[PDB]
Amino acid sequence: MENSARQVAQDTRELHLLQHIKSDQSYIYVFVFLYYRDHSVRVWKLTNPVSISETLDYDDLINNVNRCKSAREPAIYYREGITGNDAGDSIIDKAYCEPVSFMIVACGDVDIQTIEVNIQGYDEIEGVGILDSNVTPPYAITATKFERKTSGGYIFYTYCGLFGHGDRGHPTMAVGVEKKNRNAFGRMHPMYVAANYKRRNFWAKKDWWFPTEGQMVEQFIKQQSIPYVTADNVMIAPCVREIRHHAHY
Amino acid sequence: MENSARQVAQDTRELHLLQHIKSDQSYIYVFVFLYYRDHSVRVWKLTNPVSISETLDYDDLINNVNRCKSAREPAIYYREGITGNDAGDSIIDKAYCEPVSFMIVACGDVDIQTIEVNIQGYDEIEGVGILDSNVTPPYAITATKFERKTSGGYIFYTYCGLFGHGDRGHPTMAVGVEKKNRNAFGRMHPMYVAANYKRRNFWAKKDWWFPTEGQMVEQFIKQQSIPYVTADNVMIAPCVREIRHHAHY
């Protein structure tokens, strides 16, 4: 009864799930979870068939549901103070709605070795001046700092941190990653490039908000089967156990 | 008097119009018309010299002029309910401002064979989970479902449908299409690629709103000479009659 054709259709399904990862027919994903002091979470899905590239601006990274709006000072009173040094006209030093921490989850067939997580202050300008900005500051080379998580045959990567109370407490970030290519024909080789270029905005960055992590895990993480690690360090991810008829090195 | 030089300058003009289509000097366009229950239309022009790629998020697809705003429930009360199953806190089941139907008009020198119209619910996630999402679900392969419309020598394509009252009644969509290339030198060949890459956001998605189709046809469709088909199935498009000094196969 282990051998039934129905069981093999189930085997097909799960073999399909593991191979679909490496297949050109799947997406790669980076999810950015932002955790606020009110316990709520704002979440951005970045996604593409072959190449994720996105800026999350300040307005993308602050809490836009439990919003900071003293009915007294317009937004520019505060923005000017995080635009230039001592250039503010705000009685508020730090907005409540700025995130406390983040988690980056890279999943699907990412080549984690190509990932970049470049977090900057409000102006997006690395270093002391624009002409001295480096396109890749050392802390943007985050690949080896991700934790590798495994769930059966599934692999994904997590990177967590605090934004803090300095410049990066008013964050902007650029995130990019490539789909792993285990062979030599480039997904942007001249014979392929136009078909992937046509899909450069499949899909544009997309966000949601949730009242707590626990509620998000039930209503979203599990519902969409998004690999995840909770604050108490529990892995929430689908699990496809490896199927193979021969040994693997 | 048929032969006058002035008439030939007119011939030049119309020969220019037909050949400008196939020329690298023209844009390709996809227009997305969204029709609401109040009879108004929101319209997005997607456009590029060689390669259109765009996401129209939920906020792009709902009616943002005749807006849904009960002065009682914040937007997240409703959004949460179309983010996760049964996760809403809204007394409104379906927003008035969600579109009833759509028309996609692909025109200029599109290769309709490369078009993709991928409509999803709010979360933009095809299938049962992100790791099983297909980059091209069967219904995104819409090319053969477009109707081919001809106006003299001009060719364009239309695809209409209803959003309905299920998941896609809270639509997001990814649209991409390539300019037709009737010969072998790719518009993204290494000798060309950088010049077209420089124009990847020429132009970013752009929208308008109009109180009715009839008013839009007068104030916009005709004014900008955008090929179009009205709800009663009348073609509104410029018409350049073919000019040629010899027979065509």
Add this chain to the structure above:
Amino acid sequence: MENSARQVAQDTRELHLLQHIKSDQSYIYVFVFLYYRDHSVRVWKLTNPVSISETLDYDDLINNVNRCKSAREPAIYYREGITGNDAGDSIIDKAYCEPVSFMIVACGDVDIQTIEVNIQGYDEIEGVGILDSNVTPPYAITATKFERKTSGGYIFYTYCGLFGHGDRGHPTMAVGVEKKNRNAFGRMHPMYVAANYKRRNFWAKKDWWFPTEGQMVEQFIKQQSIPYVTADNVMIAPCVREIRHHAHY
């Protein structure tokens, strides 16, 4: 004492600054300064490692701090009138918040010869109709109209103008430029392309607003060392004097 190792570490620093321009490790920048009648400035940084491409829509180009909002007419009353000819329902003919003038500053290692500044009215449509629009109208070929400014070994380019009181007084604009490549290996050659494609949105267009030019020069231009030319024609830019041990042609 001219020869001290400390002085040579200073020489290293400034040699680094000049060579970092031509290095792949720097960004190219286009800044768009928009000057309003209230003397305020809205500023967009466009930036990329190798290829800038951006649309600044109408909502990006109008003053969004000193906002136009008669508590009487919704935005569409005015927008409809700049969408189609005589299609408005506004008692206001021209919004206060539309910019008077602009300056484009191209800096870092731009090849100014590849720049395009295509300014259009509200609809973004060049010419008399979409099928006749040219991807490059003559006035978009702006490269030779930029003024070349030098500050020691630093080179940058400025282009100024008025928006006026016609169609382009309701501006949209597409700006693109490539990083100068003084040799033959293309930054989008197949061996390089995927790494730069991954960084196509590093960074997305980013804006600020400032109450006056003078205040912006202190709080932003100088603070970020952004090359600049003030309204009275004073150059504000860092200055690295050329260092070389041999003569230069």
